[PDB]
Amino acid sequence: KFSLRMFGSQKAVEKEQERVKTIHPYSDFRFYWDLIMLIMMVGNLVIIPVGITFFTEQTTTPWIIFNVASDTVCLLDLIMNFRDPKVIKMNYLKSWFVVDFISSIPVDYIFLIVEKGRALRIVRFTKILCLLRLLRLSRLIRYIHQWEEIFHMTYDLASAVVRIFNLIGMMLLLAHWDGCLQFLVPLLQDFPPDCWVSLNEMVNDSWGKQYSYALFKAMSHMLCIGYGAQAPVSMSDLWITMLSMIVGATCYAMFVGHATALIQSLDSSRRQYQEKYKQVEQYMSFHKLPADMRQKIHDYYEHRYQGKIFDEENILNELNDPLREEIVNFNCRKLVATMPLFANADPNFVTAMLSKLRFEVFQPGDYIIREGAVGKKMYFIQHGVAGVITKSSKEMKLTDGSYFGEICLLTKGRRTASVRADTYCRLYSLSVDNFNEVLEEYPMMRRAFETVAIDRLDRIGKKNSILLQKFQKDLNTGVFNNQENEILKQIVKHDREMVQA
Amino acid sequence: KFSLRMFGSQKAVEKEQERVKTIHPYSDFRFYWDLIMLIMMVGNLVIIPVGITFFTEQTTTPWIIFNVASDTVCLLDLIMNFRDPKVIKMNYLKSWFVVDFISSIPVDYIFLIVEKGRALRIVRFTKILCLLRLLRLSRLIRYIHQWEEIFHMTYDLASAVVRIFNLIGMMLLLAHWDGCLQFLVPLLQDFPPDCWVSLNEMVNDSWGKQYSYALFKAMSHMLCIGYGAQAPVSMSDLWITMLSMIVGATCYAMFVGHATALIQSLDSSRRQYQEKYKQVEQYMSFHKLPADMRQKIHDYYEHRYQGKIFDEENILNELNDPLREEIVNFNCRKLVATMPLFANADPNFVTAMLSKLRFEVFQPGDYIIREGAVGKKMYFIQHGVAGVITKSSKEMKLTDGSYFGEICLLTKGRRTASVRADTYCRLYSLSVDNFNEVLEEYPMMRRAFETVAIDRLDRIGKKNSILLQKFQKDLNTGVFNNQENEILKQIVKHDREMVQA
Amino acid sequence: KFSLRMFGSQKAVEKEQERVKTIHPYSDFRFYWDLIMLIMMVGNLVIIPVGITFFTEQTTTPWIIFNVASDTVCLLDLIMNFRDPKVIKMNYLKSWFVVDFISSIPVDYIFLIVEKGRALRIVRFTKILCLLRLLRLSRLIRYIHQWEEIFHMTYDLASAVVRIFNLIGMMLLLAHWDGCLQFLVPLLQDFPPDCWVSLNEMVNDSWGKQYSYALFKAMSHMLCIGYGAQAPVSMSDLWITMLSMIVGATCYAMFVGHATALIQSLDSSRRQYQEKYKQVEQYMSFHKLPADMRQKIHDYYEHRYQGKIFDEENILNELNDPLREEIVNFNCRKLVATMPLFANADPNFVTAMLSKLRFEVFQPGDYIIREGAVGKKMYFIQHGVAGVITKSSKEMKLTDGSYFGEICLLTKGRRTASVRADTYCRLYSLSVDNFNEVLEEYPMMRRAFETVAIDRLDRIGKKNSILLQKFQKDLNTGVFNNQENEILKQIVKHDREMVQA
Amino acid sequence: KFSLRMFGSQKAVEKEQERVKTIHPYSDFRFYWDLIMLIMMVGNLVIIPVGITFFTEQTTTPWIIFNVASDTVCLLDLIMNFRDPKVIKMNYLKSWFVVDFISSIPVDYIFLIVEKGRALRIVRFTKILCLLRLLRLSRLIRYIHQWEEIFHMTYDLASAVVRIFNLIGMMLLLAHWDGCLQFLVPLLQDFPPDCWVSLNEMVNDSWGKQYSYALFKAMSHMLCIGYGAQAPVSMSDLWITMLSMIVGATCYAMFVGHATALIQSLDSSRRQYQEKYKQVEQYMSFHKLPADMRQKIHDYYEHRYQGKIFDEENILNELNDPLREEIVNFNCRKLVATMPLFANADPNFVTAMLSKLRFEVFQPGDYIIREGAVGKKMYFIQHGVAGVITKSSKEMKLTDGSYFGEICLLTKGRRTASVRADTYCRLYSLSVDNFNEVLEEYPMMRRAFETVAIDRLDRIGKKNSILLQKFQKDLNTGVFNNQENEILKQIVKHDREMVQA
Ligand SMILES: Nc1ncnc2c1ncn2[C@@H]1O[C@@H]2COP(=O)(O)O[C@H]2[C@H]1O
Ligand SMILES: Nc1ncnc2c1ncn2[C@@H]1O[C@@H]2COP(=O)(O)O[C@H]2[C@H]1O
């Protein structure tokens, strides 16, 4: 799983496990018990303020048993954290384990022993010990970080407000702690003067009502909603309210920061697309191009990228050989399945040439190949129609699953015909050097291309002396296999039928 | 349109439509009816709290008819969403369609049937059913997202606060819902004790006044403006106010996040320009350059980029062949129209060479070409004046639509004269290898360049043996066309006249 | 200036001015009068709420004259904005000029004419007309944007809170408008019931006191500081307070957004440096390198970059030929001034080689050149000391302004000696291909390098057959100039003296 | 230290120190005394509001001595700041030193002298002078910035909220100043009417109580928690409360901005990783790949990068020669230590080849080398197992510390066998050109590779004519060293044993 990936492969993980055997943190038992320990810690942290407010006056079996269970869980956690191994345990104890173990203790037994050998003072001491027992927050945060690293990155694509709920729960816990403190401070001093407790007679009211009022001001101060009293009668109340206001301000600022971070991270793709389009349009405006140019460029950009951005060259370069090769194989399955030359050929040659193609998109009406120009690349029509024109020869059309541009790459001359796009056509270009290097060691493909090129040129009417001489030399050569000749004839017939259509 | 672009080309869209025919979401009927459905849903969501506040005591024809129309619209929407096709419909029903259909029901008929077979309880049940009928928020959000994807990206350049109005409307709707809840909660319990309703006697007041007060506290709590009561008398009022404060805090945080995201996205271009300029100035300060150097570099940067940034190389590389080629053709229309050699030549050659130019800008007084140095590029003066100097030959000037640097690229020797810039001159450079590869297969351009170079060198006085030998060989060669000779003579005369000026 | 740069060069600006002459926005008169117009508009916008509060009851000469001056300024601005030119003026009038001209009118004369042909109604109409006359905010914002584009980018490096003051002034103006509205609304209705005016008897108080109270609640509501009344007695007061709360919330959100944008833009350099260092340290941790490796890499990074970041290659590539060349010339002035070979040589050769150097920094103790290895570059010691060691030859030192690594680049063999760094040394590397291409056409530099190399090798003791044969061929060749021989002898003597030291 | 790095090397620092000697800011004495000066300034700024509130009525020895010490410290700081050197001192005095010196003066002596030659007026003047003496804030901020530049960047990796505490302290100081002003303003006017002082009788209360109330409203207004009075009775109180509200709003906005900046900077690595993964997945979705493809690509990305991002090529290119070389040497210590050919060879050759390796990772089951294809690179199995298969030869396995792909790179033919990955294998690839250029000048490595290749091919059964001819020529050649032959035989035996296993 995650531990195996972080360690190495299966062999490395097995070797590490054998070395450990001959208790480590990356163990299934610990990786399952940490959740139970965190749940127990959360329950204890939620119940301790309630017990402090209740002052343990009626700590009956339902509460005493819960406190004992929490203390036992904390003791077990400390014992597990205590455990080459002796030195590590000593270092952990000297660093942080001793403090956590001291914080994890059944203070109820200590209080009972002290009383066996000031009831309000005893209750205050017990409450202070219970509050100090909540020092497991560091371990809880470490476990939460481990869980986030192990599970939050497993999908990370639900598009849900989970982190928002995380800060919501954190703020709720902070507000609960603030209310507990603001209720215990009058209780710690027993509230002699007319503070809020005597102002609203909350002591004579139900415990739920007093908790509601305390939480009410806790939330009001922690939030930026000031429903607070004009002022306080006592002396320490002002200072604890400053403390509450400070922690609430910090919590609200962190809340706003997390919210804006999430908002910025949410709309990232739209942000980069808008940035790129404004960038290109602003560059185009720098040169003061006509508005028609602006519209045409915008149309091209909107039609090539479907409102999307990607460094296709960079991403394809990053990937390894088989993944990239098979991605290319899948992306052009229609091309390889349609054009008969690819099917009746070595698949090694097919993938070797396919690995060098490049995506291109052409607007309708735009000239692709002009007669008389110098040629530098092939063109495979992946999708869309195209037109081939030449004076005194009418015109013809090429559909999907075909190709052009082989004459100049073969004879090293100049472009003969002219090629236009009658629609938004998506083609695959192949550079002259890549084509030559792929085709040089595969003479069968060269012979087939020469034959189909001769057929097409005879269809047009012009005759290339170099291509004719090459064909004559090939015929005079020993490469005259009957099966190869039949395959070439079938390919030529299919190409002629497609060109006629 | 957008659906056609997302699907493919016209042929692909037609094939998909034929396959569907032989009800799909990308249909004009649905793409027009979704707006009406969303408008009806918004009207229902705005009217339901009003009816809940009114408790349906006077649900006369104007309100009963509106409720019936909303129920009919919801039923029609559910029926349309219900509809290979049977399996898809079953999956949609099992996933979300069943819940929406249950939420879209005329609960008034059910209430009437129940009463036919506790008036306050009946009113409360009707209000609860009406509130639950607002579960079409998911479909409304989906339609809003579809509309944003279809229309907000169509222009995306109005520089107007439209998203700001979006969150403003969202906050207004949230405040309306909060006020409806805060008014119905006393109504749900009938408000026995002295809550706010008995405190201000809002029941005896007009419905508009009570709505205003409820919305007043709803907005006060939803905002971070605490005008709330010191505290509440009842028990549930505190809890519902905690809920209101929480939702208001979340809404305000999201508002602030969206606002800062929009602010950051607004000033993006200035941000990147400032970052780039501070980057370059900080690098320059790292080497501890003199302040005069700082001023000169800042002037160059401010004059090359007109306070703008663009990866011209990257953007030009991304574009396809025809768009980039025609952009280059337009950007140098003055150059091709002015210099007589370009006009009386094959346009294929013109664009082939033009495709390889590079923009350059030179400060006044800066040396561009120094005598005796080794040359590596051409220079086409697109705009600005330049000076040509050489000892014992006075000096001359070159205006726009001219060029220099051909001697070294032709004879493969060293720079003869010296070239200075008397103003901020914008030139077009052409590398030696690109120039040689473009010019090698077009011997007419080479002959014309050789002739004009010989004329210029004779004007200076120095004679190049290699160039003279090449000219003599060309004269002895068979390329002695009368039209070509006349064109070369006219070009030489024009160049001499320009050099004299 | 800015207009000249935005238009072109001096010639282009002069041509545009001549074409205009044979009133344009890029004119000095308009570019100076816009500031006066904006000042007048600001004064009018600041004085209109004061007059509305005063209800024009005592509009004596000091106020009537100010109103007349503001009206005259607005009329002059409209007249100037009114003015090929007729069509442009008509289009501007149809678009926005007509609305501004209607808003810029002396409504006092219209009111006087109407009265010549309901005193409270007349005062209310005059106040409404004065408020509507403030529609010049669009022109004011356009002028402010023009000023920001013309002046804020002139320096943009004061590190002062100027934009912060901009939003502070905007918020102050918004608060003034809100207070004016909140004071005029009771005045518009004459405040029949016991609103705040009757609550505090502000009417009987001084005008300054009433303005202070109105501004007090305006600022309280516009800010997120709710000192507002528990509730309002009247009916429209609640609605106008909702409007005030909404505008204040929007203003505060925009304030926070601008503040965080400025904060993010302020610490940009530290942010990128921290990002880069965490990036490299995290990569290094990915490979699990020892802590000593971490410290050494951190030391190297902190010593090469002085806590700075810059794409030196990219920035140097962007710059043109003369700027980059002269920057390189200045950066190595110590090198060219110290080493005697550079001074007694063609400066063209000096800059040609200097243009290809690369900065490098080496830690103390790190081996730079190891004996027996294959060499690929030169090294120029710009600063710091270095040690040359070889078995059975003791060792020697090389100070600043020297070089090594020529033996392998000359004889195309293997490294002979070994080179160590005894301190943090900053050197300049020169690749073998660049060195060969620079030195091939400058045989004097090759001869000098060969002579000094022979001297150094004889100092070590080893003799290179290829170098000796080349020296013998050069001696037998015709390049035996007395001045060149004397210069070579002096350079060899200086190199020997430096090597001895 | 930091000054030495900012100046240069040890020699440069020593030269600068000698030049200064033959008082500069980069001195240890000043760099240690600045902290004491800042501590004294902070103490004075904390004590001045307390003395102003106390009105110096009981300025006994504990306070008079503290004031005298603060004045003496300020005078010493001004004297030190006062001190080629005369011109610098004059310029500093004309710029800022004079203002600071005027602000740093013992105003108590001036007041005593004035009284020797209106007790409330004298106290007010003394308080104003004490407030004006706090103008050392500029020097304090400069010292704080220097300390941040010298120490905060030393580690910058504690992951602690130190900047948060910085703004917390800044806000606390601002609140203290605001409370001091809000308490002195009634004291400045002596508070004639019933302001807050007469409202709560704070004058008759203890000084601590009055300070608590003043700080209470200072914090309430500075924060966005409005517990402020409904309104003020006096006239100037409203204006000073506007000032307090403005400064508090600015402080809170800056607090929020710093908080969100820190939040964004904290989660940077996760942000870029999420951006990159969403980018690649979105590109993959653009081509509409099957879900199995999505899962496989996600697995590959998660296994190559351990949830990490790094431009390994860029980072490795940035580093110098020795650091990069030794990093490569450490990263492949297992490879060099395991494979016997590396150990019994020149370490120069080992590092020369190691410098050109490239990391690669392959999924289980993916074909790496297919029979009949054209080869272009080597493969070194750093970790993981691999399988070698060929028809009619069963199959074999290759473990870690081995290599394949030498046949095609040697004979320049085609791949003979086939290679599969049976697990997640991490290999090191070496390009054909780099391998040839490294191996061409080290014929011993070529001979060893040829011998092991012949052994492996004979193990398979196929015989390469070119390799056999090369081996025969090498045997007939003079390279027949007994030690080299024994080493080759041992390497061949080890390779055969490994291949058998
Ligand atoms: N009638 C035709 N049938 C098939 N292919 C053609 C025809 N005319 C032109 N082509 C192809 O279109 C190409 C355009 O110009 P080229 O010189 O590249 O070589 C041409 C041929 O490959
Ligand atoms: N005694 C010496 N005096 C001057 N230069 C030397 C001496 N020894 C070595 N070098 C230089 O240091 C270089 C290190 O190895 P190279 O083979 O590059 O060639 C060497 C010489 O250029």
Author numbering:
A (entry chain B), B (entry chain C), C (entry chain D), D (entry chain A): 108 to 129, 135 to 195, 209 to 242, 252 to 635
Provide text from the study.
Hyperpolarization and cyclic nucleotide (HCN) activated ion channels are critical for the automaticity of action potentials in pacemaking and rhythmic electrical circuits in the human body. Unlike most voltage-gated ion channels, the HCN and related plant ion channels activate upon membrane hyperpolarization. HCN channels are also regulated by cyclic nucleotides, which act via the CNBD and fine-tune the frequency of their pacemaking activity. Here, we present cryo-electron microscopy structures of human HCN1 corresponding to Closed, Open, and a putative Intermediate state.
